[PDB]
Curated annotation (Swiss-Prot):
Segments for region ([R/K]XCQ motif): 8-11
Function of the protein: Blocks small conductance calcium-activated potassium channels. Shows activity on KCa2.2/KCNN2 (IC(50)=0.0243 nM), KCa2.3/KCNN3 (IC(50)=1.7 nM), and KCa2.1/KCNN1 (IC(50)=42 nM). Induces cell death when tested on human T lymphoblastic leukemia Jurkat E6.1 and human breast cancer MDA-MB-231 cell lines which constituvely express KCa2.2/KCNN2, but not on human peripheral blood lymphocytes (which do not express KCa2.2/KCNN2).
Protein name: Potassium channel toxin alpha-KTx 5.4
Family (UniProt): Belongs to the short scorpion toxin superfamily. Potassium channel inhibitor family. Alpha-KTx 05 subfamily.
Outcome, altering R15A: 1.45-fold decrease in cell death of Jurkat cells
Keyword RNA-binding: no
Additional comment: Negative results: does not show inhibition on KCa3.1/KCNN4 at concentrations up to 50 nM.
Signal peptide start-end: none
Domain-related comment: Has the structural arrangement of an alpha-helix connected to a beta-sheet by disulfide bonds (CSalpha/beta).
Length: 33
């Protein structure tokens, strides 16, 4: 908090796989959906 996530640098690790990029506490993952 609060805050230093580049969501556009997280999405480029998720968006081509058919799921959404997620970041919480500067930790980038993708959603389970």
């Amino acid at each position: 908090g609060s805050a230093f996530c580049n969501l556009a640098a997280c999405e480029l690790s998720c968006r081509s796989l058919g799921l959404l990029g997620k970041c919480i506490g500067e930790e980038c993952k993708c959603v389970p959906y």
